[PDB]
Amino acid sequence: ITGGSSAVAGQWPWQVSITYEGVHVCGGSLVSEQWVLSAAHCFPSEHHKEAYEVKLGAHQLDSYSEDAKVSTLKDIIPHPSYLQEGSQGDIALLQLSRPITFSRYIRPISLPAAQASFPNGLHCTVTGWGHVAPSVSLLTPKPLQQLEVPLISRETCNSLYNIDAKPEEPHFVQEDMVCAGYVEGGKDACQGDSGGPLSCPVEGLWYLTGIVSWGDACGARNRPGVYTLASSYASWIQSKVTELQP
């Protein structure tokens, strides 16, 4: 996260870190006692399932926390349209090896209904342990960063991505995506934030509106972060979680 600040412990208790062979590769969001939502592209076919871990309840990746729990994965389920076509569906359900017990530091985020709309301009918050500027890592002890970002409609977002774009660069924000950020850049999600939550405030609660998916260089002007919309997958998520491990 570029242009944000460090979250206090417990602030975003659904944020998880997904590591592969012990190295943080992506964020995710706890959504039930045994399921995490993250981005499909975080889970290349080459990678071995048993080498992944999910760390929950920790705000600093390098610091021991008595409130932290770390889990392996029983299953990784990318949405089929990601595997089949690869133009969208950048979302995956991760089933933890064992169900977790919630605490003050580990709580699920509510998912939006299929037709939930989150208005352009809503100030949501993206969180993660990704780069804090293009080509600049978050330093040890790796405190979770948070950043307030207004929602930007996919239509505005496409127009912005088209400014000074190369005609042949895939910069299309699909129907299952939304953007968030600033036209002027400087504040955005960056590499390593992939898969983590865009949390939006609604009726006194927080909902998982988006999953950090892609963008151009972090914080570039005219290139706000792009997120997979959780609403677009609500029926599928609810079906999978309920069928497999309710």
Ligand X SMILES: Cc1ccc(CO[C@@H]2C[C@@H](C(=O)N[C@@H](CCCCN)[C@H](O)c3nc4ccccc4o3)N(C(=O)[C@@H](CCc3ccccc3)NC(=O)OCc3ccccc3)C2)cc1
Given the rule CB under 6 A, which residues bind ligand X? 41, 86-88, 90, 130, 134, 170-171, 188-194, 212-218, 225
Q: CB of residue 55 vs ligand X: minimum separation in angstroms?
A: 16
Q: CB of residue 160 vs ligand X: minimum separation in angstroms?
A: 13
Q: What angle do CA 19, 10, 12 make, to 5 degrees?
A: 65
Which structure tokens are listed for 132?
Answer: 């804090």
Nearest to 38 by CA among 172, 227, 168, 203: 227
Strands (DSSP E) along 31-176, which ranges? Answer: 35-38, 52-56, 69-71, 73-78, 92-96, 123-128, 145-152
Q: In what order do the strands lie in the sheet with 15-20?
A: 69-71, 52-56, 15-20, 23-30, 35-38, 92-96, 73-78
Q: CB of residue 214 vs ligand X: minimum separation in angstroms?
A: 4
By beta-carbon distance, which residue lies closest to ligand X? 194
Q: Judged by CB, which is closer to ligand X: 77, or 100?
A: 77
Q: Judged by CB, which is closer to ligand X: 106, or 211?
A: 211
Q: CB of residue 128 vs ligand X: minimum separation in angstroms?
A: 7
Pairing of strands 73-78, 69-71: unpaired
Nearest to 186 by CA among 150, 140, 219: 219
Q: Judged by CB, which is closer to ligand X: 13, or 225?
A: 225
Q: Judged by CB, which is closer to ligand X: 54, or 100?
A: 54
Q: Judged by CB, which is closer to ligand X: 9, or 226?
A: 226
d(CA 93, CA 115): 20
Which residues are identified as catalytic? 41, 90, 194
Q: CB of residue 98 vs ligand X: minimum separation in angstroms?
A: 27
Please give the DSSP secondary-structure letter assigned to residue 139.
P
Q: For residue 89, give Cα distances in angstroms to 13, 176, 238.
A: 25, 7, 15
